[PDB]
Enzyme design. Structure first.
Site, PDB file in Angstrom:
ATOM      1  N   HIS A 119      -8.669   3.315  -3.652  1.00 18.63           N
ATOM      2  CA  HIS A 119      -7.363   2.919  -3.082  1.00 18.63           C
ATOM      3  C   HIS A 119      -6.603   2.043  -4.069  1.00 18.63           C
ATOM      4  O   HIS A 119      -6.566   0.841  -3.888  1.00 18.63           O
ATOM      5  CB  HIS A 119      -7.568   2.170  -1.752  1.00 18.63           C
ATOM      6  N   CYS A 126       0.828  -1.236   0.000  1.00 21.15           N
ATOM      7  CA  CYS A 126       0.000   0.000   0.000  1.00 21.15           C
ATOM      8  C   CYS A 126       0.848   1.267   0.000  1.00 21.15           C
ATOM      9  O   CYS A 126       0.317   2.337  -0.375  1.00 21.15           O
ATOM     10  CB  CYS A 126      -0.919   0.045   1.209  1.00 21.15           C
ATOM     11  N   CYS A 129      -0.816   3.391   6.135  1.00 19.09           N
ATOM     12  CA  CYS A 129      -0.503   2.004   6.560  1.00 19.09           C
ATOM     13  C   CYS A 129      -0.203   1.152   5.328  1.00 19.09           C
ATOM     14  O   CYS A 129      -0.592   1.544   4.213  1.00 19.09           O
ATOM     15  CB  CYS A 129      -1.619   1.343   7.354  1.00 19.09           C
ATOM     16  N   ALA A 169       5.832   7.796   6.340  1.00 21.53           N
ATOM     17  CA  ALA A 169       5.358   9.188   6.517  1.00 21.53           C
ATOM     18  C   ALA A 169       6.353  10.116   5.813  1.00 21.53           C
ATOM     19  O   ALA A 169       7.519   9.764   5.721  1.00 21.53           O
ATOM     20  CB  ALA A 169       5.209   9.517   7.984  1.00 21.53           C
TER      21      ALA A 169
END
Lengths: 386, 386, 387, 390
Positions: D346, D87, D376, D384
């Site tokens: 997504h 992801c 996540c 991040a």
């Protein structure tokens, strides 16, 4: 000795991935058999032997006819056989029932046919032993074991195209034939004519009571369709019968067995006949089929009030009419497969119901049903109302 | 009209991916068909109609029976049907041809069956319409369309384990039947007992003349092997018939037709019968079949010199011998499917040939052939040598 | 700033459905990641990031590098990525690791690659939406996503054939190169020279694979008579082209400061790396450029280099690189190459780095260059010296 | 070296077998890249290295990133790598591009990702060696290699449901955040706020050629049905099709350079990258990884939530964003201000780079200077990035 048809029923015919796509060939069979038994005025338990035609049995699980019979509510004590004579399976089922009743093997039988062309699976010919290295093949079961010549892999369509050229049959002629069959199929649905041969199917939930394909077709687009089977050919999707889903079933008995039950049967079978010739020539075999039936029966073309000659391709019916000098006035009076589609397993017995219903409603007594059969053959049945 | 078996031929039986793995069902049907016709002392053009047993047609291309007749050297004029009554198919093809002769539809027919279980492809179910999301199955056609109960997914062997528990048949009982059957088959191979029913197959080019499984089987280890259908069960790969490949064809005529041709038939079909009951109970169907057959013909077991009773499982022949009070010394005397294999399309007609061979060589006169059928059925045929 | 290789391991290279067919690419990566880390003399937990090359990930399940890391004893706190630079995937892995350490992202990383071309599945392209009607295809993942040119559908060997003709390379030259690679690879197995780079792989009865399979099953006598592999009157064969193969490779990398902070002695320093990218049809030449770009950035010349590892995707790749750069065959692939051993696509790039290091240690050199060609028209090169 | 984002673009997000079903992952990749390299005011040739995130590469053909670049029109001289960090792939591609830039490997790069979840094929595991006897399996590549835990075989939604249960998160709370995400996403579409980040995609139908300019799922979502949707992951569950992001098609690409190289070209870059961090933990606790990733980023940068004007915390589920917001003490008015994955979808391979583009765009239009982007990752991870507008 005289073999009578006591009753029968067919489902609506569904378009490819159309209104009966949710229903297995077994469940379509079960519905036709159930209704034919009920119409016949007998209990489930009286049916001695079932024979059901089915051309595409992969993925149907063990004993398509056996599954169909039990889910029709016929008891385990009813012996079942599934048969494959391609396009003719349905008629061949009525012809075996017929010979078994004359042989004295049984007194009450169900014969008929079922196909879900929508639910034919794909097959992997090298899955079991291993593909090993490099790209491989997934085969369409319906093309491989149904619609294609085995020796040359050519669609029955591309055979039909060489015969139509050989006989000077035209694009416009086959479109004119296919438009008229469409109009007749529409008229027959609209005036309630087909109701008497039909059993509705329920498929969240929904009742299919009418043939799908003739209520969806656009007659306007027909003169502009691309050739389906050969570049710059004359045969199209609309002047050939469409891939379809349906089932049909009859209750046959000896006459003594009808009368012993106090039943008035619909029709006696006068005779049946088979013509077998080169696979390349399958669209011509009904001519042969029917000349054999005339010779066996005593009948000539003058004795027959209605014909069902199946419209596998518009050209099949037209060449049969031409070679045998028939009027389109007497032939496929409620239309046929070009308008409605061809569930290969079922059409052979389906055209036999349709012939009866029309003899009953149009006021004839004598009929001939006939269809061509992949691999170069054709079956024909001669029939009298009582 | 008396109905006669003029001649017949059967391929060796091959094991799963064994000696005949390189040969299609269709080609096995053709070797057998051509040799029967040859042995009958007629020409190919003389055969009016063909019916052949075939349980797994996926991958075989259009009209299995049709491809077999034509590759046999039968003309396009001989008409052809494929049938499916599961493990009963070959016996049902002979029963249909019997009844068609009695009805007067033909005078000369070939009936039999043909199975390549090795070459049964894999099936992909919802590929056509689209799997959309989530994992799916790819089905063994042989399992899905041949051996598994439809309604339960259960292998027939699982039903046979149940029935055998319920009837108190033990592992050492089933294994004793299996070791005896094996010694009979090996002895019969070595004897040259089965050279008269077999036609060799060419697949370098090596000729296959003998049943391979009897020769490859480890008589020693039969009581060592693991149970097949339940971790603590009693039925094994060796007291159940194995997956196999083979075919078999007979020539049937009227008495009068063989007389007109000055032929000496092998045998008369005195009669046939079917029994059908619950699928879970298929292993017991042959008892009912043989009961219907004695009733239909006024025969008794005391009238029968030799039985051929298909060993689909040892417990099927042991339970039919228990309930009819039969001598094992008169049942399956050249062995059976526990040693040889069960090519499900062909075995029904194969055992009819094997019964005639052993009657001639062992010098009886009256024979019964019977076998169990997926879906809860069994078929039975009474014959007499002429 | 200074970046060192602390240790490494590679699995043996198994043939197509040969010695490691029972082992998944994730499990071959796990064996190589585990031993690299035991040989480094660090704890599983001292590894901050993993990067593993893997060209054929279909059927391997979610996160091939994540699975191999966890199976290798590394804790969930170690972040993992999977990369595909085709044949270069495993060199590129080491290359990204080098840059991440340069940049201050980590102090301790694992980099390498894994491939099970034996376990590559088949793919069905339209089954989700529907085949509808007609015969379709089932595609070999190894061919569709690994070995065929995407734009043309042509095998890499078909490009390689055209280039070999253009450069005047003969059947006899390539076969002669490939017989020498065979003899070197057999020598090195038999005399134990490969032991120190290899970690054996126990299979399932249970048995231990410790030797590269393919050089030991090769028929030298047949080589000169084989059919052309990629064009009906070509010079290239299964024999002078590299074979489908299974295996994995793994190196521990650190800043030099972290190496001495933990008091280790590393195997080697990485002096630099380079990439050459050109037309996919010219992929066999791209190493020539890659080494050129490397010589330009290190300030090295061919003559500063004691040993070369130039992957034998095709024998003409190493031959043409050797001719253009004027290299001594005696200083190039001294224990043989992929014409004998195979090419496990995702592993090879990092594998030749480990082989180059073992070769310098035992043959007694200091400065090495590893380079390989890459499907899609590319090449990577690494400059090493021993400490 | 300071590292700047010069420009970027992201395709509209297509629903499962919806608006972008006829375009390959690579064609979506090509489109995003070509638009990013144009908006960056450079020539195709000035791009020295491509790194594209892609989680499902079965059936995309040899070298998905390589085909994406060549088709976009970057020359063969431009080197290309495909990466899989599930992801987070898109965001990982940019972090690697940041590192290589810092290390002096390149001066001009393209990073992003690309996924076509519509066009992921099926796989047959035993077909090579053969099924021999008995029924086998045909596996959904999206499921097997994308969406389920290798160890357990469980859908990522299963873990999500178990964490939600563990923390006592209610259907009502989850739906209320998804209803707000969709309102935000509808309002963003209608007043043209998403126009600047989006490159339209050209598609075909039996109608001919059309242009997809808008995210289809926010437009075709039923807001009123959402409290009534069946649960998605256990008989009597709280997670649904509406409070979990949907399967989706989409690509994104950024041009990165060193600040020096952008200065040298007279370009005015959108943003500087202030740093990145990763958090990895048990695969079962992937939905909680973003919390650690931001804590680690705060630690590496010297920032606190008080330095941050806007956040993008990808809505893999409503509960991912909701738990990060609660544990970091965040204002929802400053988080996913143009909606997120619950409304839009997504595309697992693109979402990591996409949100970075959305965060820059939100910052320019809604105001502010400093943003954090975090999401996540299947396998128990989270990345991040902190960035500053220039």
């Amino acid at each position: 000795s005289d073999i009578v048809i006591v009753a029968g029923a067919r489902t609506p015919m569904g378009g490819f991935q159309g209104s009966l796509a949710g229903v297995s060939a077994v469940d379509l069979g079960a519905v036709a058999i159930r209704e034919a038994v009920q119409r016949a005025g007998i209990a489930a338990e009286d049916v001695q032997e079932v024979i059901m035609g089915c051309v595409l049995p992969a993925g149907l699980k063990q004993g398509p006819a056996r599954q169909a019979a039990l889910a029709a509510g016929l008891p385990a004590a009813t012996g079942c056989t599934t048969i494959n004579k391609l396009c003719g399976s349905g008629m061949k089922a009525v012809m075996l029932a017929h010979d078994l009743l004359k042989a004295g093997t049984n007194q009450v039988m169900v014969a008929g046919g079922m196909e879900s062309m929508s639910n034919a699976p794909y097959v992997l010919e090298k899955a079991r032993s291993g593909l090993r290295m490099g790209h491989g093949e997934i085969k369409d079961h319906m093309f491989l074991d149904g619609l294609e010549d085995a020796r040359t892999g050519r669609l029955m369509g591309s055979f039909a195209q060489e015969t139509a050229d050989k006989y000077g049959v035209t694009r416009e002629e086959m479109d004119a034939y296919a438009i008229e069959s469409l109009k007749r199929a529409q008229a027959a649905i609209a005036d309630g004519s087909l109701a008497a041969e039909i059993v509705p199917v329920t498929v969240g939930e929904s009742v299919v009571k009418d043939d799908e394909q003739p209520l969806t077709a656009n007659l306007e687009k027909i003169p502009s369709l691309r050739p389906a089977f050969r570049k710059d050919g004359t045969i199209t999707a609309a002047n050939a019968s469409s891939i379809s889903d349906g089932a049909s079933a009859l209750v046959l008995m000896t006459a003594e067995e009808a009368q012993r039950r106090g039943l008035k049967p619909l029709a006696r079978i006068v005779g049946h006949a088979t013509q077998s010739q080169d696979p390349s020539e399958f669209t011509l075999a009904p001519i042969g089929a029917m000349t054999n039936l005339f010779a066996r029966t005593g009948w000539s073309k003058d004795d027959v009030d209605l014909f069902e000659i199946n419209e596998a391709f518009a050209m099949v019916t037209m060449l049969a009419m031409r070679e045998h000098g028939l009027d389109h006035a007497k032939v496929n009076v409620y239309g046929g497969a070009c308008a409605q589609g061809h569930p290969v397993g079922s059409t052979g017995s389906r055209i036999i119901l349709t012939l009866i219903n029309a003899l009953r409603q149009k006021g004839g007594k004598r009929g001939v049903a006939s269809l061509c059969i992949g691999g170069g053959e054709a079956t024909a049945v001669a029939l009298e109302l009582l």
